[PDB]
């Protein structure tokens, strides 16, 4: 950003999904992979584990 | 005369209380001290210091003011009954009785909108 | 209200509060009735910023 | 549609502003809010400054009217330094700063609504609905 | 025919023997309807009112200690209705220290399997029932509701100190009797222990009968050099 | 059984406007409320659109800023309506657009311009029209690099 | 902790000098909590929610 | 049969409370609840007479 940059970390990607079955569709693949992410829209509830 | 002390801390203002009570000492030895407070916690504390420094503290009547100054009523004016008529409960259950038969007078239309709608006398309650 | 009253006799047992801590200097502020809370209208005054009370820094009382 | 900018918008009658996305919506609320709290703009003014419990605001989640709470008193706590000192860097609060004739009551009543902002008149719309009625209950014929 | 020795026990009915000896007039007769009415609400039969009657009225007159007899001759200008007292307790309380001169100067000090209590300090919440004077020698009173004697045979001189040993109400004794001295040194300017005090009456508020001396009445005299030592411990 | 949900006081407030009482209920809100700044008027209601209109729509003195942003109504679903946005700006006469854009990347921004000026009448309503915006000052050096 | 008050209320209308509300209250009981406390204070509140790591702001008091 | 007294005694008393009566006649209505559905322990006095108190209170200033 313009002179001044910083790298790249985990934190800094995001990715959109618009519904729960996708959302594990793509968590499946990249956990496979083993990039750990976190599905911040979970409507799960805590007695459903 | 009424005396109005102001300080900065409740510890010498206790200590002041102290003070006059341990320089003035009451005639009828069965006569209760009476102090105006408003919580229990506030009279807790105030019978534990007393207590730490007398020795013991007992005939301490901790009233709240209004209760304090309806004493005074009773005791300074006659034929005063020991409870007034008109309380939070007592006031309640009369408008119970007296609003409908006060109703349709010509200047309680609002309230003949709010009850007369529909009541299990829970909106009039 | 009290200050309203004309049979009244009034007396006061103001003890101090010597400023050393941080609560120390908030509570007498409060007494004293003053303000030294620094604003800086003019900017010879807005620049420098020795005129506030020194805090030391191992000063836990707030 | 006419490009807007907040020191000049007309209060009166129904203003539809339409904010596109990563505009600030945030910061133009702000900026009228100033401006309604201390009386400003001459044609485009609402003709008589107003205390803060008299702004009502209406957002979507309590999140939200939490964070526009926050951001209204902190914009109001920079403006009355800024009226203070009659010296300011934002640029928006410089535009407020010539804007404004009397900087010693702004500066007064910027006070009083910062320190009465406890009480400040954010709701969502449930929340806006059930204390209005609980006001008007007798109009509204609903219990206490 | 129903009486006192009849009457049921439990904890709510000595709360509802306490409760008829809260508000009473003690001068004037009882009201028939209002002690009825007070039977209404503790929810109790109505076929004790009578006997309640004569019971209370029984008590009323009783000559609990040679003078100050028949306590409807009571003047409210020289009652206390519920005392509570405060009692601070520093220098933490050691109970055999304590148990010590228990043993040695209270006389009712054989019946000790004691100190079931550790070491504390601070205050000593307590409530007195009664305290009242009688030209002088101020009485101390705590009314207690206790067993099924079925018979007077329960309500004796010695079965009464026994049973009174068996519930350690010694303790009782000395607290109350040090709460009462500290109180009146604060308040009374300058009296003697041995010229004011004319202390205990524990009355067994069961097991009183109509026309029958020494029955449910009980008295305590301290040994006065035991309550000078003991407040010396508590404020050393 | 006495209990209140958020629909019901909605329709509560709703139908006691509605009512013979709803003028002296709208004068005491006029009075105490005179001036209303609604956020995010896009995810609106029929109901909540009523009340402002009953409450603020005449009798001067009063403003209302209704705040939206009409391309985002992306909750059909929730219940909120797109097609009561589109009945308020007929309502309303006056329209006000911001300007300029600040979070995004300054090609990002004209990309975005780009892909919705495609064809015209991008949003397939004629009451939405795509005004394009423009970059922020500050940000037009914003870059990224990989490998 | 807010209380608003009945509406049809006449002390709310016009109020005089002794009038009491909650609102005023708790604000004076926070002042004499800051004043009553001798050696320590100990100011706690809720930062960021737990869930979605959001902000939550200070009381206007703190 | 003990469930079945439970019921037949939740079924007359469901019938018995439905009218309405001045508050002369609710006054007997709680005592008669407590000393026909519970049994009193040593530890439910305490709460029974409470219940019983509060109940009587709000009759003594309605009456």
């Known amino acids: 950003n313009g002179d001044d940059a910083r790298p790249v970390r985990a934190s800094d990607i995001s990715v959109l999904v618009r519904s729960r079955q996708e959302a594990a569709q793509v968590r499946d693949a990249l956990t496979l992979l083993e990039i750990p992410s976190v599905y911040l829209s979970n409507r799960d509830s805590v007695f459903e584990t | 005369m009424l005396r109005v002390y102001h300080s900065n801390r409740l510890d010498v203002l206790e200590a002041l209380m102290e003070f006059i009570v341990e320089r003035e000492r009451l005639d009828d030895p069965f006569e209760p001290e009476m102090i105006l407070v408003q919580s229990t916690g506030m009279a807790q504390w105030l019978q534990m210091t007393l207590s730490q420094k007398f020795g013991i503290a007992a005939n301490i009547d901790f009233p709240l003011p209004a209760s304090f100054i309806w004493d005074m009523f009773v005791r300074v004016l006659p034929e005063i009954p020991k409870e007034s008529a008109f309380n939070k409960q007592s006031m309640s259950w009369k408008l119970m009785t007296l609003l409908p038969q006060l109703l349709e007078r010509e200047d309680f239309t609002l309230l003949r909108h709010y009850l007369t709608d529909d009541s299990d006398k829970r909106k009039l309650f | 209200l009290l200050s309203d009253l004309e049979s009244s006799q009034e007396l006061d047992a103001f003890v101090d509060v010597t400023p050393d801590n941080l609560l ?39 | 549609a006419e490009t807007l900018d907040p020191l000049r918008l007309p209060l009166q009658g129904e203003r539809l502003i339409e904010a596109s996305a990563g505009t600030g919506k945030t910061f133009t609320i702000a900026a009228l809010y100033l401006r309604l709290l201390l009386g400003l703009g001459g044609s485009a003014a609402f003709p008589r400054p107003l205390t803060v419990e008299e702004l009502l605001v209406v957002t979507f989640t309590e999140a939200a009217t939490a964070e526009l709470r926050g951001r209204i008193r902190s914009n109001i706590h920079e403006l009355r330094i800024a009226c203070l000192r009659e010296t300011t860097d934002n640029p928006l609060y410089e535009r407020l700063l010539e804007e404004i004739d009397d900087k010693a009551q702004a500066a007064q009543w ?14 969502t719309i449930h929340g806006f609905c059930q204390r209005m009625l609980n006001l008007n209950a007798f109009e509204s014929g609903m219990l206490f | 025919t129903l009486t006192p020795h009849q009457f049921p026990r439990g904890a709510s009915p000595g709360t509802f023997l306490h409760s008829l000896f809260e508000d009473l007039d003690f001068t004037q007769p009882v009201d028939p309807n209002w002690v009825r009415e007070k039977l209404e609400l503790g929810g109790f039969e109505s076929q004790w009112e009578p006997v ?28 206390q209705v519920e005392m509570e007292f405060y009692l601070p307790i520093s220098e933490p309380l050691i109970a055999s220290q304590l148990d010590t001169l228990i043993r040695q100067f209270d006389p009712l000090s054989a019946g000790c399997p004691p100190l079931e209590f550790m070491q504390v300090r601070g205050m000593l919440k307590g409530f007195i029932d009664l305290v009242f004077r009688h030209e002088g020698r101020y009485y101390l009173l705590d009314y207690k509701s206790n067993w099924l004697g079925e018979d007077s045979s329960a309500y004796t001189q010695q079965a009464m100190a026994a049973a009174m040993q068996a519930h350690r ?27 004011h005090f004319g202390g205990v009456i524990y009355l067994f508020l069961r097991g009183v009968d109509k026309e029958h001396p020494q029955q449910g009445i009980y008295t305590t005299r301290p040994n006065a050099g035991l309550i000078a030592l003991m407040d010396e411990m508590f404020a050393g | 059984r006495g209990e209140l949900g958020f629909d019901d006081m909605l329709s509560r407030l709703d139908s006691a406007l509605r009512s013979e009482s709803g003028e002296v209920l709208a004068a005491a809100i006029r009075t105490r409320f005179p001036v209303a700044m609604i956020d995010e008027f896009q995810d609106t209601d029929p109901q909540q659109y009523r009340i402002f209109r009953r409450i603020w729509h005449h009798q001067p003195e009063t403003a209302l800023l209704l705040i939206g942003d009409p391309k985002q109504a992306i909750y059909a679903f929730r219940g909120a309506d797109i097609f009561t ?30 892909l919705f000026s495609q064809t015209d009448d991008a949003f397939m309503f004629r009451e939405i029209p795509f005004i394009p915006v423009k970059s922020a000052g500050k940000n037009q050096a914003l870059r990224f690099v990989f490998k | 902790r807010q209380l608003a008050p009945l509406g049809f209320d006449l002390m709310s209308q016009k109020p005089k000098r002794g009038d009491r509300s909650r609102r005023d209250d708790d604000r004076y009981l926070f002042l004499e909590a800051l004043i009553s406390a001798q050696q320590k204070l100990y100011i706690s509140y809720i930062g960021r929610s737990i869930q979605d790591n959001s902000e939550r702001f200070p009381s206007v008091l703190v | 049969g003990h469930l079945a007294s439970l019921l037949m005694q939740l079924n007359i008393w469901r019938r018995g409370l439905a009218q309405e009566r001045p508050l002369e006649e609710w006054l007997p209505v709680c005592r008669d609840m407590l000393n026909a559905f519970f049994l009193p322990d040593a530890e439910t006095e305490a709460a029974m007479t409470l219940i019983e108190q509060q109940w009587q209170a709000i009759i003594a200033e309605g009456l």
């Open chain 3, 24 to 62: 120390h200097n908030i509570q007498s502020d409060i007494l004293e009735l003053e303000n030294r809370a620094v604003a800086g209208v003019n900017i010879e005054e807005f620049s420098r910023s020795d005129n506030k009370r020194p805090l030391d820094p191992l000063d836990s009382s707030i």
């Open chain 6, 85 to 114: 946005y589109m009945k308020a700006r007929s309502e309303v006469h006056a329209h006000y657009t911001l300007d300029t854009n600040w979070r995004s990347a300054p090609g990002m921004v004209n990309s975005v311009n780009k």
């Open chain 5, 169 to 195: 109400y010694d303790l009782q004794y000395q607290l109350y009797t040090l709460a009462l001295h500290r109180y009146l040194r604060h308040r009374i300017a300058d009296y003697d222990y041995e010229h």
């Open chain 5, 52 to 79: 309640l009657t004569e019971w209370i009225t029984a008590v009323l007159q009783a000559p609990l200690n040679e003078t100050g007899v028949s306590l409807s001759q009571l003047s409210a200008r020289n009652k």
């Open chain 4, 110 to 123: 910027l006070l009083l609504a910062e320190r009465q902002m406890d009480e400040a008149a954010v709701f």
